[PDB]
Design a protein around this ligand. Structure first.
Ligand SMILES: *[C@@H]1O[C@H](CO)[C@@H](O)[C@H](O)[C@H]1NC(C)=O
Ligand SMILES: *[C@@H]1O[C@H](CO)[C@@H](O)[C@H](O)[C@H]1NC(C)=O
Ligand SMILES: *[C@@H]1O[C@H](CO)[C@@H](O)[C@H](O)[C@H]1NC(C)=O
Ligand SMILES: *[C@@H]1O[C@H](CO)[C@@H](O)[C@H](O)[C@H]1NC(C)=O
Ligand SMILES: *[C@@H]1O[C@H](CO)[C@@H](O)[C@H](O)[C@H]1NC(C)=O
Ligand SMILES: *[C@@H]1O[C@H](CO)[C@@H](O)[C@H](O)[C@H]1NC(C)=O
Ligand SMILES: *[C@@H]1O[C@H](CO)[C@@H](O)[C@H](O)[C@H]1NC(C)=O
Ligand SMILES: *[C@@H]1O[C@H](CO)[C@@H](O)[C@H](O)[C@H]1NC(C)=O
Ligand SMILES: *[C@@H]1O[C@H](CO)[C@@H](O)[C@H](O)[C@H]1NC(C)=O
Ligand SMILES: [Zn+2]
Lengths: 675, 174
């Protein structure tokens, strides 16, 4: 009886939801294709109706006992509804939390950094600072952009993030989770046989295990980059120490892609770029997607439907309306699949087309599932399936048969590494960042790190795990892990770790079924229907089965495994190893760019304020009396390092408002001794 | 007999409330001379080369995927609650895709999802009361267990071929 009642409830939910979520998603599409004041309010209206329905149904779902249900595809759907859609908060705390998140998003998105010679000139992150960090070679300009962002947006998000953490934990406990960090990783939890079970608190053990196995390769990549980078930024990088945070070619140091032009193995060897071939042969934006389709079809996957070809915005329409040029695949529901892109005839957007069609093939594969189960087995599978496809079509062998790469083109083992190195900077160089960012957040939500220790632990563990050091010291008025998109906007970041690991497990499995004989980095699953159909079986399951069993039937294992990643980059590893023979590999967490010239001193924030003011005072008089110079040093010009409360700290002083110009140790020491 | 008022009709009814007209000269120029028009065409107990040598027509709008339920000895939401044919059925079922006509802004078609028991062959239930999942009747859909038995088809101009309206005509030869 109670199981049948649960089934009736779900039948009602699924049949009612299917033609309601459709309207909300359709309205969203129209808005992003045609941006207007009328379309935005219609988008919200449609969304509101769907949200209200979901909340009511989620609350109803709570009064069905899971122990009374003997069906797995029923119990699972009830669990999904019971643990979402309805927070347990006072109305005042529901108005508030939604007023901090909106505030943080806005502060990030409208944040700008001004110039210390000119105030009416301010650069924004998206059209501005981002194109400086990824191009400039000027140590001083890179420092300005790096520090300015964190000292402008970072200082605004600190008090908001503190309230955010407290309220989110209370919310998470309303679902019977220990904290919000625990809530986030519930997606990896599975129920079933003792052999196929997985606990949410197991993830924090497994990602650490994989990292330890990765590190030995990262250290070789790190050492190589350091010795090559040292020739671009001399006197700023130590042969035994950490890399400066602002010299990684990025605002956050998420990827090392932009260091390639500085750290390229074989500068005399060109990379493959068929942008010119595509233009010469008269390719358009449509042909790119037709070729992407052909690839998937050759391995036994379904053709793209007519609705896709007629409704998708594959190319920017020209004019008359503003569109959002941010590539993404859409599932509108009810057999309506689309891709939204502003496609250009380039190589980089060729690989992208393959990647976004990887999504749409997956979305089709599990379309037959119950509404609530129409998702990936795991959050990391959806991007593993998409990305594994871009590896097989980046191979010269594919371009040669396509006719994009010149006939009789010669390749060798000098250029395979030139290539793998570029990939390592994206795939390996990002893993320790993702790892420690999420690890820090978990500790913050859990309550292991007191508010007063947020910034001290952030940089402490970052130097230990990643091997990157700040150019200037930061106190607790800053919030570095808030000036990044995913942290400010409440997104989980672990999905960018596990998908990298799964991606290569899938890659190797596919290249094995396809009977590849040779290096793993030069495989191609095109024309291989035996590998394609095996993949399809793994996709069609959706979320109806636990990811552990879904993976096992495809990769013949259970836990995530980095083995395949280390093997993929094995060549490179054995090459870097023979290059780093005269250099030091690894780093020591006791060197800093500002530690060479500072004064050691041997008590709350109000006492430190007075101290810094006093130092600025001594400086003003020293310079005026000794060199007859009038320089107005302020409290903000005295930086404090290595604070060990009550007992000791280090400090140094810079010229007024000038970050790069540090007063020579013997000169500031003079000012202190003088007064 | 006015086959043109069934096959060339400006509007069809919902599947939950199907209409039936009684059938003169038994012409077949609209059934077996143009078969490229129909997407589905199956006969039971009779062949296209035999029919030529009372026939009542039941017609309604149903989504593509549910067209397969319009047959003898079938089960499913439509077969069990909206439109049922007997196992011992003689006649033909014809259907065609009318996405360009029925999938508009104000065109709402309904089917029955919940009922206290299955319907008999050729039974037409057009009532509309709240369904109590625990048995009997109830009021207010806010109460757990109360559901509306009639739900719409989310037909729109751009949706999959399996969620596109089809016009079905069933010719039962008695
Ligand atoms: C975009 O939306 C506005 C507001 O309704 C409308 O006037 C305009 O015609 C739309 N653009 C297109 C191409 O439909
Ligand atoms: C759960 O269903 C039972 C049985 O009708 C009823 O006693 C109880 O009030 C319901 N609980 C909730 C939360 O609606
Ligand atoms: C669960 O219900 C589905 C139908 O909704 C059925 O096909 C499946 O066999 C059932 N499984 C079990 C264990 O009852
Ligand atoms: C492509 O480039 C070659 C250069 O040798 C040129 O001869 C050829 O005409 C170009 N193709 C087209 C379509 O112009
Ligand atoms: C796109 O829509 C037009 C409407 O004029 C139609 O004729 C064309 O065949 C459609 N495209 C496809 C692939 O059906
Ligand atoms: C796949 O096979 C076809 C022949 O059916 C061939 O033309 C095409 O180049 C092959 N693709 C690859 C990547 O080898
Ligand atoms: C590339 O292979 C040749 C053998 O064909 C070898 O002698 C050469 O040293 C290799 N290049 C590198 C960087 O190992
Ligand atoms: C509708 O009438 C026209 C004109 O007689 C005929 O050609 C067409 O086949 C009819 N439609 C159907 C479904 O019979
Ligand atoms: C139309 O039906 C008649 C009678 O069955 C048949 O003789 C004729 O060949 C059919 N026309 C076509 C084009 O098949
Ligand atoms: Zn992706």
């Amino acid at each position: 009886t109670p199981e049948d009642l649960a089934k009736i409830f779900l039948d009602n939910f699924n049949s009612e939801a299917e033609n309601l979520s459709h309207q909300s998603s359709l309205a969203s599409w129209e808005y992003n294709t045609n941006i207007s004041d009328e379309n935005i309010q219609k988008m919200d209206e449609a969304g509101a109706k769907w949200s209200d329905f979901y909340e009511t149904q989620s609350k109803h779902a709570k009064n069905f006992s899971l122990e009374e249900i003997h069906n797995d595809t029923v119990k699972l759907q009830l669990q999904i509804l019971q643990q979402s859609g309805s927070p347990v908060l006072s109305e005042d705390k529901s108005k508030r939390l939604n007023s901090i998140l909106n505030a943080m998003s806005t502060i990030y998105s409208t944040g700008k950094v001004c110039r210390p010679n000119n105030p009416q000139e301010c650069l924004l992150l998206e059209p501005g600072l981002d194109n400086i960090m990824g191009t400039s070679k000027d140590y001083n300009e890179r420092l300005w952009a790096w520090e300015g962002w964190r000292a402008e947006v970072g200082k605004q998000l600190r008090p908001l993030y503190e309230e955010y953490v407290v309220l989110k934990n209370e919310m998470a406990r309303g679902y019977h989770y220990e904290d919000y960090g625990d809530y986030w990783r519930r997606d990896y939890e599975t129920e079933g046989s003792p052999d196929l079970e997985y606990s949410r608190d197991q993830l924090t053990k497994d990602v650490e295990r994989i990292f330890a196995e990765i590190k030995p390769l990262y250290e070789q990549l790190h050492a190589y980059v350091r010795t090559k980078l040292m020739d671009t930024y001399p006197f700023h990088i130590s042969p035994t120490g950490c890399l400066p945070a602002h010299l990684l070619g990025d605002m956050w140091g998420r990827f090392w892609t932009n260091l390639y032009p500085l750290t390229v193995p074989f500068a005399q060897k060109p990379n493959i770029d068929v942008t010119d071939a595509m233009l010469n042969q008269t390719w358009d934006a449509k042909r790119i997607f037709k070729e992407a389709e052909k690839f998937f079809v050759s391995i036994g996957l379904p053709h793209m439907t007519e609705g896709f070809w007629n409704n998708s915005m594959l190319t920017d329409p020209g004019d008359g309306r503003k569109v959002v040029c941010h590539p993404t695949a859409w599932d509108l529901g009810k057999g309506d699949f689309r891709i939204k892109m502003c496609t250009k005839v380039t190589m980089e957007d060729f690989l992208t087309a393959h990647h976004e069609m990887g999504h749409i093939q997956y979305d089709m594969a599990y379309a037959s599932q119950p509404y609530l189960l129409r998702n990936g087995a795991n959050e990391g599978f959806h991007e593993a399936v998409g990305e594994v496809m871009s590896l097989s079509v980046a191979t010269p062998k594919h371009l040669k048969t396509m006719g994009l790469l010149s006939p009789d083109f010669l390749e060798d083992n000098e250029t395979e590494i030139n290539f793998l190195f570029k990939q390592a900077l994206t795939i390996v160089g990002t893993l320790p960042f993702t790892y420690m960012l999420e690890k820090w957040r978990w500790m913050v939500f859990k309550g292991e790190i007191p508010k007063e220790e947020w910034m001290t632990k952030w940089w402490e563990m970052k130097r230990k795990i990643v091997g990157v050091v700040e150019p200037v010291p930061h106190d607790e008025t800053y919030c570095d892990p808030a000036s990044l998109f995913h942290v400010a906007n409440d997104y989980s970041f672990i999905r960018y770790y596990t998908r990298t690991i799964f991606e290569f497990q899938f890659h190797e499995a596919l290249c094995r079924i396809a009977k590849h004989d040779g290096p793993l980095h030069k495989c191609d699953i095109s024309n291989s229907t035996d590998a394609g159909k095996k993949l399809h079986q793994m996709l069609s399951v959706g979320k109806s089965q636990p990811w552990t069993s879904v993976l096992k039937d495809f990769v013949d294992s259970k836990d995530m495994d980095v083995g395949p990643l280390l093997r993929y980059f094995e060549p490179l590893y054995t090459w870097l190893k023979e290059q780093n023979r005269n250099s030091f590999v690894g780093w020591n967490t006791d060197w800093s760019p500002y530690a060479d010239q500072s004064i050691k001193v041997r008590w709350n924030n109000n006492e430190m304020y007075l101290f810094r003011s006093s130092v600025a005072y001594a400086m003003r008089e020293y310079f005026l009396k000794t060199k007859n110079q009038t320089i107005l040093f302020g409290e903000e010009d005295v930086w404090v390092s290595n604070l060990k409360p009550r007992i000791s700290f280090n400090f140094y002083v810079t010229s007024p408002r000038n970050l790069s110009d540090i007063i020579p140790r013997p000169e500031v020491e003079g000012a202190i001794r003088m007064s | 007999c006015p086959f043109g008022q069934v096959f060339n009709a400006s509007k069809f009814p919902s599947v939950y409330a199907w209409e039936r007209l009684r059938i003169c000269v038994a012409d077949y120029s609209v059934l077996y001379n143009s078969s490229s028009s129909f997407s589905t065409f199956k006969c039971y107990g009779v062949s296209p080369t035999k029919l030529n040598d009372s026939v009542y027509a039941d017609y309604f709008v149903v989504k593509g995927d549910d067209v397969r339920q319009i047959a003898p000895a079938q089960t499913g939401v439509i077969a069990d609650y909206n439109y049922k044919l007997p196992d011992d059925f003689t006649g033909c079922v014809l259907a065609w895709n009318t996405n360009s006509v029925d999938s508009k802004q104000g065109n709402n078609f309904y089917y029955r999802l919940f009922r206290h028991g299955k319907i008999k062959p050729y039974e037409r239930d057009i009532s509309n009361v709240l369904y109590n999942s625990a048995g009997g009747t109830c009021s207010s859909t806010s109460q757990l267990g109360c559901y509306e038995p009639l739900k719409s088809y989310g037909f729109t101009p751009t949706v999959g071929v399996g969620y596109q309206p089809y016009r079905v005509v069933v010719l039962s030869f008695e």
